[PDB]
């Protein structure tokens, strides 16, 4: 018969026996016959008995209660209507916007793309954030870890990213909240709501309070979302590219460690799920650019124990295509975005990749900034007077670079009425290389604050 009954449960573990003729395969959906609790097939304990974890609470439930199968893994709806809705792990409405209209659903646990499906080329992913555009340029199917503390508009940063991707290239965006600090999630919802960006992104949060399994699986949930969206192709083929932001995959690792303990198998060397690398690859290699269409992913990450030798960041670095860090003092200097420009690094920093001239200009700029940091200490301890003249020029020009980095945003535009800044590559570089000639030493550093292109800078200098 197509259902079984509860035979034993401990902790988060559930056991049910079946007949030998009907027993599901792994990951298939199992609904508790009598409540809304759902069970995920994990491994076959034999004797008609199989082990599963329930999605949701563990009470209200006692042995002998029947539980059925769907003989299929978790299938959650996919469609354009998914935008603007916040859903549970099971893709069930939690914004109280009614049930999702789209009944077109797809399975989750699915195979990574083929070798043939590996996009045969690599090319620079673009955006409007000059420091991103130059100091850490991205590529489609990109994976960058984010670093920093709290109080810098990380959310705001993402908002501008989504606005730009939906504007320039109509690239879609989805977010997954893993271990969300519920209040912060609500606040972020309101924030993305006042901004009309709400309509352009799909929302599911895994609140840390939940049973660790669903918290684990929300990742693949949003992953499948993005897969469908990119594979959702307009005319002429070549569907749009999609963007994914993942909330602190470190929390995901923690949940994996939890559930690893839950099965009651071996805790690893430092103590982790030993299979962590495999599920890493499950995540990563399922995300890239395709032969037609791409999905790029930007992921929050916290470093436990502030160490770079514990396993989690080590495994993480196997996939971080670039490094982006946020510095507190930079925000304290009113510089926005408050990204530390000098130390965030991109693997995609080769003249082979970024372009020869582009590479040279970037190298020179970072050299200048490095020099300036070597200088400002001697300045403060000895006054700006005691420097060589070229040293002073470097000081002023680098500070001009920092000011030029300061820019308003279209997200800031609604926040405080002021036209946002949109700037591509080869638009920044012209002004930068001109600055390398020192042709703006007459131009005050103030003429670079909260400004877009170098033409706008010179216009400001005119009005100033």
């Amino acid at each position: 018969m197509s259902s079984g009954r509860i035979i034993q449960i401990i902790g988060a573990v559930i056991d049910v026996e079946f007949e030998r003729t009907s027993v599901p395969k792994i990951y298939d959906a199992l609904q508790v016959d009598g409540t809304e609790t759902t069970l995920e097939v994990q491994q076959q304990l034999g004797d008609g008995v199989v082990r599963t974890i329930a999605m949701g609470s563990t009470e209200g439930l006692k042995r002998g209660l029947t539980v059925t199968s769907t003989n299929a893994p978790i299938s959650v709806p996919v469609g354009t209507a998914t935008l603007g809705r916040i859903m549970d792990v099971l893709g069930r409405p939690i914004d109280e916007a009614g049930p999702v209209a789209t009944e077109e659903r797809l399975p989750i646990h699915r195979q990574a793309p083929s070798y043939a499906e590996q996009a045969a080329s690599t090319d620079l992913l673009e955006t409007g954030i000059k420091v991103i555009d130059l100091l850490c340029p991205f590529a489609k199917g990109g994976k960058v870890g984010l670093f920093g503390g709290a109080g810098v508009g990380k959310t705001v940063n993402m908002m501008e990213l989504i606005n730009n991707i939906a504007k320039a290239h109509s690239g879609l965006s989805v977010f997954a909240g893993v271990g969300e600090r519920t209040r912060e999630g609500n606040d972020f919802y309101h924030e993305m709501k006042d901004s009309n960006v709400l309509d352009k992104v799909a929302m599911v949060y895994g609140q840390m309070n939940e049973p660790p399994g669903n918290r684990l699986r929300v990742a693949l949930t949003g992953l499948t979302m993005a897969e469908y969206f990119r594979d959702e192709k307009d005319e002429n083929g070549k569907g749009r590219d999609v963007l994914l932001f993942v909330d602190n995959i470190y929390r995901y690792t923690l949940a994996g460690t939890e559930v690893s303990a839950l099965l009651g198998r071996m805790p690893s060397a430092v103590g982790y799920q030993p299979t962590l690398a495999e599920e890493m690859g499950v995540l990563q290699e399922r995300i890239t650019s395709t032969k037609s269409g791409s999905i790029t992913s930007i992921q929050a990450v916290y470093v436990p124990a502030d160490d770079l030798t514990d396993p989690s960041p080590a495994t993480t670095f196997a996939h971080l295509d670039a490094t982006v860090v946020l510095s507190r003092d930079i925000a304290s200097s009113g510089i926005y975005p408050a990204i530390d420009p000098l130390d965030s690094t991109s693997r995609q920093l080769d003249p082979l990749v970024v372009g020869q001239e582009h590479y040279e200009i970037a190298r020179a700029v970072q050299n200048v900034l490095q020099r300036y940091k070597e200088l400002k200490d001697i300045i403060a301890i000895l006054g700006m007077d005691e420097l060589a003249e070229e040293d002073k020029l470097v000081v002023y020009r680098a500070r001009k670079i920092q000011r030029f980095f300061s820019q308003p945003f279209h997200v800031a535009e609604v926040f405080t009425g002021a036209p946002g800044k949109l700037v591509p590559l080869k638009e920044t570089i012209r002004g930068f290389k001109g600055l390398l000639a020192g042709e703006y030493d007459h131009i005050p550093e103030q003429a670079f604050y909260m400004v877009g292109g170098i033409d706008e800078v010179i216009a400001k200098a005119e009005k100033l």
Binding site: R20, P24, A269, T288, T309, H319
Partner: protein, 506 residues
């Protein structure tokens, strides 16, 4: 059209012509591609195991009443009670020159999607090392297209030599260059991808076919997402394919990439068998587990060839050269697995983080990087020109180290420092910049002759390249002659210094 019809008809008239006697064992327990099977007694340890799903298995535990085994691939379409038969035959893999220009499954199945290829020979993967009475001293060079490498750290045919460094510090690019060097040599070269990103994979590929190297070349891959079994097993298979030509008196070359992933994957798998671990979750045999594979590469006797091919050859000594890869966490050379592997290799190379951070590409920590064989493969020119220069610069390193908290420097220390600076700047090259022998030959000549302690610090490399141009333009027959031989004569160096003065005049 109809040709496929005739082919399929005759292939159908071919086989399945009769029933077969066989033995089955059905599933009992399953977890993570690791299964418990009961009912097969005729089984072989680690044999191929038949399954209705079309996949196969390798046998692990011959207990009294069942067997545990390992999947080869994913297993989500599997469940207890299904049918599971035995091949009665050990693990193998197709091997042949046909593998050239192809990249396939870790079980030799074309992932390139360029048609399946038959290999009239197939060989068991797990094999033992040859006999000591058949080994041959390493006597033949291998060129790396480098100045730093080829000179200070010689590597000959058949030597094993680990490469160790950090992330994005230049670990592979080096092996790649070495392979590209072997283009003209025509030696056997083959590399294995082991648990890395397919993006990186296709990058390597596209580079290779760009070079056109992927015609005397074969590579197989273990994807980072593939279930750990293939990661564990693949390097053995690659060694198996490589040994084919060494088994034919033909020098061979293998490149192992990131054995650390394979090591940890095996650790995990074996631990899932609940076996007790040793230090940092590693079981003890891991040392053996890798080393047994490593010993399979060596330079052997033509006598061994005859004992292998029993008339099918005239008898020439064969060899296989080993390129393993292990990463170091925070530059911990004393790390456990590194300590294990260094005890195995015939030598090692380590790359310094800061110099690559300082832009020195490559960035050698020559301080600890040595070969047990050393001067048994270098050309007489190279061997005589080298010999202590690596030691000299190593001591220059520690001199500079001591020379920062003391203000006194004698003229010995002064000269050592100033010449170390020049020779340091002398050991630079570009990515994909190979060298003919005369290149580094004239460079080191100039260095030893103090012909560099005289010219501008920065202009060193410019002088070097312009010198190469100067000579290979004017002296092209000269360097052609010298690099075609590898032998030095004094009149040759007379011509060299004549060119030295002429170019210094320019």
């Amino acid at each position: 059209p109809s040709e496929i019809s005739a082919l399929i008809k005759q292939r159908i008239g071919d086989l399945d012509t009769s029933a077969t006697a066989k033995n089955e064992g059905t599933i009992v327990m399953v977890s993570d591609g690791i299964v418990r099977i009961h009912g097969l007694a005729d089984a072989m340890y680690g044999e191929m195991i038949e399954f209705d799903g079309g996949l196969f298995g390798m046998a692990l535990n011959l207990e009294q009443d069942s067997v545990g085994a390992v999947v080869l691939g994913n297993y989500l379409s599997l469940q207890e009670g299904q049918k599971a038969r035995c091949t009665g035959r050990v693990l193998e893999v197709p091997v042949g020159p046909e593998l050239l220009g192809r990249v396939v499954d870790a079980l030799g199945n074309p992932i390139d999607g360029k048609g399946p290829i038959d290999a009239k020979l197939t060989d068991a993967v797990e094999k033992v090392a040859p006999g000591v009475i058949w080994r041959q001293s390493v006597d033949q060079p291998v060129q790396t297209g480098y100045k730093s490498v080829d000179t200070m750290i010689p590597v000959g045919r058949g030597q094993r030599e680990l490469i160790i460094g950090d992330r994005q510090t230049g670990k592979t690019a080096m092996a790649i260059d070495a392979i590209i060097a072997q283009k003209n040599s025509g030696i056997k070269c083959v590399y294995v991808a082991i648990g890395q990103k397919q993006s990186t994979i296709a990058n390597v590929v596209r580079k290779l076919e760009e070079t056109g190297a992927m015609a005397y070349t074969t590579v197989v891959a273990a994807a980072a997402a593939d279930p750990a079994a293939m990661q564990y097993l693949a390097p053995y298979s690659g060694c198996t394919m490589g040994e084919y030509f060494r088994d034919r008196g033909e020098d061979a070359l293998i490149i192992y990439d990131d054995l650390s992933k394979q090591a940890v994957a095996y650790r995990q798998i074996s631990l899932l068998l609940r076996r007790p671990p040793g230090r940092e979750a590693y079981p003890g045999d891991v040392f053996y587990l890798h080393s047994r594979l490593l010993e399979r590469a060596s330079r052997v006797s033509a006598e061994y060839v005859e004992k292998f091919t029993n008339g099918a050859v005239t008898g020439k000594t064969g060899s296989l050269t080993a390129l393993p890869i292990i990463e170091t966490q925070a530059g911990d050379v004393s790390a456990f697995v590194p300590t294990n592997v260094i005890s195995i290799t015939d030598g090692q190379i380590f790359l310094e983080t800061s110099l690559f951070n300082a832009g020195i590409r490559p960035a050698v920590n020559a301080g600890i990087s040595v070969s047990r064989v050393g001067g048994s493969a270098q050309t007489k020119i190279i061997k005589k020109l080298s010999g202590g220069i690596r030691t000299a610069l190593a001591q220059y390193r520690e001199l500079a180290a001591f020379a920062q908290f003391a203000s006194d420097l004698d003229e010995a220390t002064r000269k050592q420092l100033e010449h170390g600076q020049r020779v340091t700047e002398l050991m630079k090259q570009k990515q994909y910049a190979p060298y003919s022998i005369a290149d580094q030959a004239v460079s080191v000549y100039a260095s030893n002759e103090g012909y560099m302690a005289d010219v501008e610090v920065k202009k060193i490399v410019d002088f070097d390249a312009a010198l190469i141009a100067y000579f290979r333009s004017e002296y092209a027959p000269l360097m052609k002659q010298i690099d075609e031989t590898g032998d030095y004569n004094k009149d040759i160096e007379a011509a060299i210094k004549a060119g030295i003065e002429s170019f210094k005049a320019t």
